[PDB]
Structures are given as structure tokens and as C-alpha cells.
Design a protein around this nucleic acid. Structure first.
Lengths: 93, 98, 79, 107, 91, 99, 79
DNA sequence: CCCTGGAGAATCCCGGTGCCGAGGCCGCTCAATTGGTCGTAGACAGCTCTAGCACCGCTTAAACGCACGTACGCGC
DNA sequence: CGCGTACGTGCGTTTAAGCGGTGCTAGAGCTGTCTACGACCAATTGAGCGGCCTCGGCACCGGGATTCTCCAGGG
């Protein structure tokens, strides 16, 4: 039927990459899909919000870097920044 | 022959422990379903709700009331009490801005 | 549909407070909790009514309830 | 053309870079979306996903369960202080609350 | 450069309802921020509303739905009626 | 002879009526301004603040503290008291969700 | 710059309580109010720091503080 | 009136069923991927000039401190 | 209802907040410049998801038990 975009399998591979002996129910899967989408809307909304104030038309990696610093607090922020910085350097290389 | 006669408070704490580690829905389904339809019929008649639509409403209302009860209970010990009052809820909503 | 505010029974309000760690529950709490729940339901459902009216739909879906809860800082996961 | 290698594997990531980029373009945020913005978004989402699931897996072993069910996700979010502040305004269905009792409440 | 402001339009509104009083620039900045903050809230809700039903456009119904979602109580039906009257006068 | 010797609370009410109708800022500009600089020194060593930048932070902090004091005061009468307590603020932030 | 948390003097905290309708002010409330103010400032100013850093600027503007307060649901009118 | 032994009941650990939701597999198809091509936002370089930073008189209302007692937090 | 202390009230004294002034430069707009970058267009292609097969983890049902809790007896 109609293909609905979801992060059902993507969370599953993340779970097995850090915990290859546990599973996850569909109700917990839907919570994770809602959790990913809400954080996606918050950061992309913030990144769009940041670009409008600087009169900038594009959203770069620095837009996301500032967005996750504003939303995620403290130690959770800098690991996400470090993980984000590592991903961009690996992608460019 | 003597009855057990549990003193008040111990079984209430037992109910607290048995219901904090559990995840079943405390409010019954149709009584919450019928309350939604009566409230919605004041805004618009001939309105229907999906089964999962009320499911979203029921869990959100319970968690909001549980969190309100947590602030309501926290006000009781702050007021040197263990019994919650209707004025405790009114203070809780006012501080939250509701 | 009348007298449906009493559907939230006193043990149901008692059970809700037990989840919140409430030691003792007064007799006037149940009437106040019903009124608070009625006010909270009157805001979420009305917001969901406008969401359903905007979509040219006659049945309120779970997604519209999520958006009604999300706009007031009470976002819900799992639906 | 060349081999259709996914951008997630190029960046060493599991979350879809293309889906994030597609949702950023159609999500009505900006006129243009940069190249590294979906890569940064995928890394942040994956790290947040991995952190909670590891804590949910830790909570699952506390109650001896091999399947993640919504009580474990709620327990993982509230126990972590940063996840508590990040999701303070977030309601989790079928999760309940933390089983904590006031000090003066015990006999 | 030129900076966008809502100062003069509010002044004509002020003289329309109360021609016997003025306004200060310090209060003007508060009202300028007030109109702008409501502007992003309604447009943000309307943009979110269009994204929910996969709508690529924002109409008068998009603004009307955002008003009843944001403005509570009897204030909303005034803005709905005022918007409806302006729409009918526009055509 | 004796002075007027106002009872405890009488001058407090006069200060309540005066500051609830006057919009002058209670916190002094310079001691608050230097508090911004030492807080921002932990995040950026070479940072500057505009006069209006410190101005906007002061009013938001004053209004937040006034709103916090309103909730703190209301908890006192709720707890059969007229004196605000540090536990009342801790209750106020937790109910508001600000820990 | 050290010991600047004492810049919020005792009458200044007392004046803030009087604006909030507080009748009696405890002697231990000044340390708690300073701690609450320090925590509140450590969030908004840090948020404005990231706003200033992202804007390719080395001076914090009131405009950046406006969005820093707005993103936490504390929008300020009058800048 | 407080300390300690025994037993009633809600709760916790454990063996057996199984079943229905979770895990794994097959297409395959539609959205993710590859290459090119421009309009164009953006990084970079030089000017500047308007507002912030640092120090100085001063004076004066704001603030620290001490003496006293009565509204009030707290114990019972 | 009783105790007491600790915070309201009041000025002495001090001390820095603020107004006004002067000088410097830190740097944000402003204007060119030139340059890679992403939306869009052909062209394509490969694993996500609907669906189907399988299977096993914990709900259910009891069975048993440690095990924590209250009532009664003794000093």
C-alpha cells in the first residue's frame, strides 16, 4: 500500500549496534519514532529560526551545531557536538 | 478471633508502590470515552473519535493529573501535611500558570 | 449524554493519586480533580476540534490530538 | 554512473542522511539546505537514540527483560538528568512515573 | 538602511479608537514586539497546519484555524468575525 | 518621648504598594552588569555586552524573580505562613519544572 | 571578576520581594534567590553566547537575548 | 511503655503453556543515489565610524551593621 | 497555647551607583569580489516497508516461599 516514512528499522540497527542481545516492542518503537520526529522538528525549526535572524538563506552544519547547543543541555550537548563534528569530517573526507 | 485491621497509610503506600512500577491504565476506557464525547458535543455535534485517538487522550490526561498530583502531594509536605486538599491543587495550577 | 463527569470514579481518582505518591486523599479532592480534568479536556479536545475542522474531517484522529497536546508544551509520544 | 553508496555509510552513520535532507527540504525551513546539515542532524539523532536505548537496555536488565517496552523508555528518560531536562515537557504513554516515595511518607 | 516597523500603523489604530491619547516610543517598541511575536506564532501555526494535511498553501482558513488555536475564549471569535468581515470587504 | 515605631509589616505594605505601581528597576545597573560579565566569562573570554543587551537581561531577570516571589509568597499562606522560605522557592521551581 | 554574586544586595532582593507582594522576607532567602538568579542567568546568557557565536559577532546584542529568552517560553517585549 | 517472638496476608521467586506480537525473509518500487549546470548566497578583503570599554571627579541615594522588641515560625 | 529568636524598624556610617566627561579602539555594517554550492534536470538503482513465515518472551496460571509486618506476651 502507501509507503509511510518512519524510523522503525533505523532505531533497530542503532539498538543492535549498542545492545545486540535485547529487543524492542512496537509500542516502544512508536515512542522512539515520535521521539526522533519531535527532536527533528525542534532542531530544524531552531536551525531555520537561526538562519532567519542572520538573514541567511541556507542551513549549514553550524546551524545544526548552534541548534543542538541551545536545546540539548550540558554534557549531552558537547557529545552530540563531538559526534556531529566527527560525522561531518568523515563525510567530507 | 481478631481481624487484621490494617492501620491507614500502609496499604496506601502499598498501592503507591504497586501502581508506580506498573503501566496499566488506571481510568476505565468507556467512562473516559463517554466523557470525551459529552465535552466534544458542546463544541461540535455529530463528532466521532477514533479508538487510538481516545488512547492518546487517556494517557496524556492521566500523566498530566499524576504530575499535578505529584505537585499537589509535594505541597502537602511543604505545608507540614500528608493529606492533599482542594486548595493544594489550586496552588499547583496557579504556580504552573494554568 | 449527561452526568458523564462522574465517569471518573472516586477510586479512579484515588488510583491516579497513588501513582503520584499521594499518602492521603481528601473527600473534596475528587470533585476538584474532576473539574481540573474537565477544564484540561475542554482545551485539548477543542484544539483537536479545530484541527479536525481544518482537515475537512468529521472524526478526530490521534495525530490531531498529538498536535493539540504539542502546541501547549505537553507533547505525547507513542501515537 | 558510479556505485550508489549511501551517505550514511560514507559518514559512518546509521540514520538516513537522504531522508533527513529530504525532510529538511520539504519541511519548509529554509530556501536551501547545506550539505553537512543532514549529516550533523543524523549524528545528533543517532547519538540521542543510542544513549536512551543503552539506558533503556540498562533499565531492561534491572527488571530482567530482554525486550524494550515503554516503561523502560520512560525509566531511561527520567533517570538521566540531561534526558529529564531535555524531555521535561514531554509525556510518554504507557510509561508511568518514577517509583519514588517521600522520606516522611514511610512509617 | 531601512528597518521594517509597525509603529505608524498602530498610531492610526490608536487615533481611530482613542484620539485623545498618544503613545511613547518606549511603549511603541513594546507594541512593535507584541505584533511581531503574534505574527510568528500565527504564521508558525499556519505553516505547521499546512504541513499536517500536506498542504502547499496558506489560505484565510489557515490563519482562522491558528487564531482559534492560539487566542482563547471569546477573544478568538472576535478576530474570526473581524477577519471574515475584512475578507468579505476585500472581495 | 518615643518615635512613631511602625509595627512589623506596616512599612512592608507601603513598599508593596509603591513597587507594584512604579516601574523603576529595583536592581542597580552596575552590580547586575558585572554579574553578566563574570557569568559570560565562563563561556567566552573575549566577549562584550551592549548597554541595551544588559538592559534586556535585567528586566527579564527582575520579572522572573518577581513572578517567582509571587509563587513563593502564595506557598507561604498555603503553608500557614507569612514569611517566605527557601523550601518555598524549591517547591516553586519544581512545580514550574525548573528544578 | 570575582564575588560578583554579592552585587545583588540585600535591599535589592527585598525590593524584588515587595514587588511580588511578599510581606516578610527571611534571612536565608538571599542566598537562595542569588542561586536561583545565577542558574537563570547561566541559561539565558549561555543561550545568548551561542546566538552571538553563531552570528559571527563578538559582542552580545539585546536582539540575541530576545531569542534566547523566547526559545525558553519567556519572550520579552520592548527589547 | 518499649523490646521481641510468632503467624496472617500481600508480595516475590519459580516451573509449565503458548500465543500473539516480535524477529526474519522476498520483492521491488519509489525515494535515495550519481553526474552536470548554472544563479546565487556566502566567505573574504578593505573603510569606517558609532557605540562599548577603561579611568576619573563627586555626590548622594543605596547599602552594611548594630540595638530593640513584638508579629510570627515552630514545638507540643 | 507557649517559647524565642530572628527578622521588622530605625538611623550611623560607609561605599559604590550613577551622571557627566574624555580617549581608544573592538568590531558590525557597508561595499566589492570571486567562488564554491545546492535546486533542478536526466538517469538510474537498491534496501525500506507491506506482507508472509516463523518463533520465543513474557502474560497467564498456579506452586511454593522467603520475608517483612503486625499483634500479643514479657520485663
Amino acid at each position: 500500500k502507501t509507503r509511510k516514512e518512519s524510523y522503525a528499522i533505523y532505531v533497530y540497527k542503532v539498538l543492535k549496534q549498542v545492545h545486540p542481545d535485547t529487543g524492542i516492542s512496537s509500542k516502544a518503537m512508536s515512542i522512539m519514532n515520535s521521539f526522533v520526529n519531535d527532536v527533528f522538528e525542534r532542531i530544524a525549526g531552531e536551525a531555520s529560526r537561526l538562519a532567519h535572524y542572520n538573514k541567511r538563506s541556507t542551513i549549514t552544519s553550524r546551524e545544526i551545531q548552534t541548534a543542538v547547543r541551545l536545546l540539548l543541555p550540558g554534557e549531552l550537548a558537547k557529545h552530540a557536538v563531538s559526534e556531529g563534528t566527527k560525522a561531518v569530517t568523515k563525510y567530507t573526507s | 478471633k481478631k481481624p487484621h485491621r490494617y492501620r491507614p497509610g500502609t496499604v496506601a503506600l502499598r498501592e503507591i508502590r504497586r501502581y508506580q512500577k506498573s503501566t496499566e491504565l488506571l481510568i476505565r476506557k468507556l467512562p473516559f470515552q463517554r466523557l470525551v464525547r459529552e465535552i466534544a458535543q458542546d463544541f461540535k455535534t455529530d463528532l466521532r473519535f477514533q479508538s487510538s485517538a481516545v488512547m492518546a487522550l487517556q494517557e496524556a490526561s492521566e500523566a498530566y493529573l499524576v504530575a499535578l498530583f505529584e505537585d499537589t502531594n509535594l505541597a502537602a509536605i511543604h505545608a507540614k501535611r500528608v493529606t492533599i486538599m482542594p486548595k493544594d491543587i489550586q496552588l499547583a495550577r496557579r504556580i504552573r500558570g494554568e | 449524554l449527561r452526568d458523564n463527569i462522574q465517569g471518573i470514579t472516586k477510586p479512579a481518582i484515588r488510583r491516579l493519586a497513588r501513582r503520584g505518591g499521594v499518602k492521603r486523599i481528601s473527600g473534596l479532592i475528587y470533585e476538584e480533580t474532576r473539574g481540573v480534568l474537565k477544564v484540561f479536556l475542554e482545551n485539548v479536545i477543542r484544539d483537536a476540534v479545530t484541527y479536525t475542522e481544518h482537515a475537512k474531517r468529521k472524526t478526530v484522529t490521534a495525530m490531531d490530538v498529538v498536535y493539540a497536546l504539542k502546541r501547549q508544551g505537553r507533547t505525547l509520544y507513542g501515537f | 554512473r558510479a556505485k550508489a553508496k549511501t551517505r550514511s555509510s560514507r559518514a559512518g552513520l546509521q540514520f538516513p542522511v537522504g531522508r533527513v535532507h529530504r525532510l529538511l527540504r520539504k519541511g519548509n525551513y529554509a530556501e536551501r539546505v547545506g550539505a553537512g546539515a543532514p549529516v550533523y542532524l543524523a549524528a545528533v539523532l543517532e547519538y540521542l537514540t543510542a544513549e536512551i536505548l543503552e539506558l533503556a537496555g540498562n533499565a531492561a536488565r534491572d527488571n530482567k527483560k530482554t525486550r524494550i517496552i515503554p516503561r523502560h523508555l520512560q525509566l531511561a528518560v527520567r533517570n538521566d538528568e540531561e534526558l529529564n531536562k531535555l524531555l521535561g515537557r514531554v509525556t510518554i504513554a504507557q510509561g508511568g512515573v518514577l517509583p519514588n516515595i517521600q522520606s516522611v511518607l514511610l512509617p
